[PDB]
């Protein structure tokens, strides 16, 4: 490919890049072909100069045969054209719209060197926001750019009569969906007669998409239609009534792991949902079923009934756990969800060599918040989770219980690609009968997502015989720092501290030091860490994990 060369005296990288852009590829042209190509080359170059405000540029062209060949354009810019008059006006209703950005910046103040493209940028901005906010009757009354290369003067005149702002018309629903329009309309994030906003149409689209009820949605409403109302057309393609799913995963904690789901995304016209799910790992097997009923609002408020069975053989404990539950989800505009559920549990538990059996009916509630840059490659996000529950003995309970659990995950990124990670977890169980307290209610620490350097669930107080039986309280606190090595490749350096225990005064928090590497795989995030344990007899340990950072 015959080398093309741009020389600017005196240096102007923008001009050089622009000329290198309009000139384009020379290809594998020999000397002769380049000689034919010279006039085109100079023409393009002077277009680029005119595009940057440069109207008195001396442009000459050299051709030199070689391996490969080359053509040297000499540009000698001269002083450019600067703005005199700049009148950018948005009239009509839009004049009073808060979030309607007017064209601004250094490049549009009088005296600045004129770039050709900047004007069209301003125009595009105005029309893009016009279209975003439903100013479909917006017409340019004035579009004028005026340039005199001699004396170097340029005038801008953009007068934009926006006309009336449209509003949402009626919303119509068609398609082979059996979902009642009563439900569908309650997940429209706008009422008719409300000022148009295309991001509200987007919100409607994503709403309908997320309900799970369909395999396809057609949400459209081009400017159409005397106040002027924009009708909104929604068409729905019913999803396959049943669906199967299988997933594979691996971990240092539990080893090889399999997930399965069997979902029924709509059972009836009221939008009820059915589900089954299971997971298989060497140290843990579980099966679960669920039923959901949308309340009001349908998307953020719902009832969820659940059941489950789980076998677990981990460290020094075994457990067969049966559970039933009713849940009430409601989410406020913050991003805070509140789950209010009642759970019943019956635990078959072998702790070390001591066999227990106990039963519980615990009223509990939870709140969750999550704000992310999202959704598979978050640049910063915060997750906050809080769950508490209780057992009143006599009232279908073998003991009292006060199970408090809290978890936070933070991420921030600074500058040219650095990431800071923060995790904290804490939990306290209270009771008047610890022996009656089953494993699921006791607290375990350590492992990949807790305190690296230590194997899964090995941080727990020991019993008389040295078997890890579970703590009354626990904590973890972790921090991770990532350095960009490549796209999809980050470096990691982390500190971890944690330890579960029976006495608040003696936490004995085990420290963990370690470094690893994160790869975004074409199957998902992968994290391979190498952690040195600082406490007890702290050898070295390899941790592996998959999933989102938050």
Residue 184: is it exposed, middle or buried by C-beta count within 10 angstroms (0-12/13-18/19+)? buried
Contact 443, 425 (CB under 8 A): no
Q: Is the dihedral of CA 457, 463, 465, 466 positive or negative?
A: positive
For 244, the enclosing helix (H) or strand (E) is strand 243-249
Instruction: Tell which residues of the chain come right before a gap with C–N over 2.5 A.
Output: 225
Q: Which residue pairs, CB below 8 angstroms and at least 24 apart, start in 281-285?
A: 281/251, 281/254, 281/255, 281/256, 281/257, 282/254, 282/255, 282/256, 283/254, 283/255, 283/312, 283/313, 283/314, 284/254, 284/310, 284/311, 284/312, 284/313, 284/314, 285/310, 285/311, 285/312
At residue 271's C-alpha, the angle toward residues 266 and 277, to 5°, is 45
Of 538, 391, 383, 369, the closest CA to residue 452 belongs to 538
Share of the chain residues as helix, strand and coil, in percent rounded to the nearest 5: 15, 50, 35
Of 278, 270, 167, 289, the closest CA to residue 221 belongs to 167
At residue 305's C-alpha, the angle toward residues 188 and 307, to 5°, is 140
**Alpha-carbon distances of 251 from 20, 256, 481, 520, 547, rounded to whole Å:** 51, 6, 22, 16, 11
Sketch out the chain's domains with CATH numbers: 3-76 (3.10.20.310), 82-161 (3.10.20.310), 167-238 (3.10.20.310), 328-546 (2.40.160.50)
* Lateral strand order in the sheet of 58-64: 3-8, 70-76, 58-64
Phi first, then psi, for residue 201 (nearest 5°) are -65, -45
* Lateral strand order in the sheet of 214-220: 167-175, 229-238, 214-220
Please give the DSSP secondary-structure letter assigned to residue 269.
Answer: T
- How far apart (Å, rounded) are the C-alpha atoms in residues 88 and 109? 11
Strands 70-76 and 3-8: parallel
Q: Which residue pairs, CB below 8 angstroms and at least 24 apart, start in 26-31?
A: 26/1, 26/2, 26/71, 27/1, 27/2, 28/1, 28/2, 28/68, 29/2, 29/69, 30/2, 30/65, 30/69, 31/63, 31/65, 31/69
- How far apart (Å, rounded) are the C-alpha atoms in residues 420 and 480? 6
Residue 50: is it exposed, middle or buried by C-beta count within 10 angstroms (0-12/13-18/19+)? middle
Q: Token pair for residue 113?
A: 């060197």
Task: Identify the bridge partners of residue 347 per DSSP, sorted by sequence position.
Answer: 321, 358
**Alpha-carbon distances of 169 from 182, 201, 379, rounded to whole Å:** 17, 12, 38
Residue 484: is it exposed, middle or buried by C-beta count within 10 angstroms (0-12/13-18/19+)? middle
- How far apart (Å, rounded) are the C-alpha atoms in residues 134 and 229? 11
Q: How far is CA 312 from the centre of its chain?
A: 33
- How far apart (Å, rounded) are the C-alpha atoms in residues 187 and 177? 15
Of 505, 512, 500, the closest CA to residue 538 belongs to 512
Sequence-distant (6+) residues with CB within 8 A of 22 are 44, 45, 47, 48, 51
Resolution stated for this PDB structure, in Å: 4.0
């Amino acid at each position: 490919e015959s080398q093309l060369s741009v020389r600017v005296t005196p240096a102007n990288a923008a001009l050089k890049a622009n000329i290198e852009a309009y000139v384009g590829s020379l290809g594998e042209r020999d000397e002769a072909a380049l000689q034919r190509f010279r006039r085109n080359a100079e023409a393009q170059a002077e277009k680029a100069a005119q595009a940057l405000g440069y109207f008195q540029a001396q442009i000459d062209s050299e051709v030199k045969d070689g391996k490969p060949p080359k053509l040297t354009l000499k540009v000698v810019p001269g002083e450019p054209v600067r703005l005199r008059q700049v009148n950018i006006q948005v009239l009509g209703e839009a004049a009073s719209l808060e979030s309607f950005r007017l064209p601004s910046g250094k490049q549009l103040k009088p005296g600045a060197k004129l770039n050709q493209g900047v004007y069209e940028d301003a125009k595009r901005l105005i029309q893009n926001q016009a279209s975003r906010y439903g100013f479909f009757q917006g017409r340019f009354s004035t579009q004028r750019l005026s340039i005199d290369p001699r004396a170097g003067i340029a005038d801008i005149d953009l007068v934009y009569d926006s006309g009336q702002r449209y509003t949402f018309g009626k919303v119509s629903f068609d398609g082979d969906s059996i979902i009642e329009e009563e439900l569908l309309r309650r997940m429209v994030p706008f009422k008719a007669g409300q000022p148009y906003d295309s991001e509200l149409i987007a919100e409607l689209n994503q709403n309908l998409q997320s309900s799970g009820y369909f395999e396809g949605v057609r949400v459209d409403a081009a400017p159409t239609q005397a106040r002027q109302a924009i009708p909104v057309a929604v068409r729905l393609e019913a999803r396959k009534p049943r669906t199967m799913g299988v997933g594979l995963g691996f971990s240092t904690d539990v080893g090889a792991r399999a997930r399965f789901n069997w979902t029924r995304h709509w059972v009836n016209a009221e939008g009820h949902s059915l589900g089954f799910e299971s997971e298989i790992s060497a140290p843990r097997q579980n099966v679960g079923a669920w039923y959901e009923i949308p309340l009001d609002p349908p998307l953020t408020d719902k009832l969820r009934f659940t059941s489950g069975y789980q076998f677990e053989d981990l460290v020094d404990t075994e457990s067969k756990l049966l559970t039933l539950g009713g849940e009430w989800h409601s989410k406020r505009p913050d991003g805070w969800q509140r789950v209010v559920s009642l759970n019943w549990m019956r635990e078959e538990y072998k702790l070390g060599d001591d066999s227990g059996l106990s039963s519980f009916l615990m009223p509990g509630i939870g709140y969750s918040l999550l704000e992310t840059d999202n959704k598979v490659d978050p640049s910063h996000g915060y997750r906050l989770q809080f769950n508490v529950k209780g057992a009143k003995e006599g009232l279908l309970a073998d003991a009292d219980v006060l199970h408090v659990d809290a978890m936070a995950k933070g991420l921030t990124s600074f500058a040219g690609g650095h990431r800071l990670l923060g995790r904290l977890q804490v939990g306290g169980i209270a009771t008047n009968d610890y022996k009656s307290i089953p494993p699921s209610l006791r607290f375990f620490a350590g492992g990949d997502q807790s305190v690296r350097g230590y194997d899964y669930r090995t941080l727990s107080p020991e019993n008389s015989d040295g078997d890890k039986i579970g703590g009354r309280y626990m904590i973890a606190g972790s921090v991770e720092y990532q350095y960009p090595l490549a796209e999809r490749w980050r470096l990691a350096t982390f500190v971890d501290q944690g330890n579960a225990f029976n006495s608040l005064d003696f936490p004995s928090i085990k420290t963990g030091v370690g470094f690893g590497v994160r790869w975004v795989s074409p199957v998902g995030p992968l994290r391979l860490d190498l952690a040195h344990a600082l406490d007890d007899d702290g050898g070295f340990r390899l941790h592996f994990s998959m999933g989102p950072e938050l």
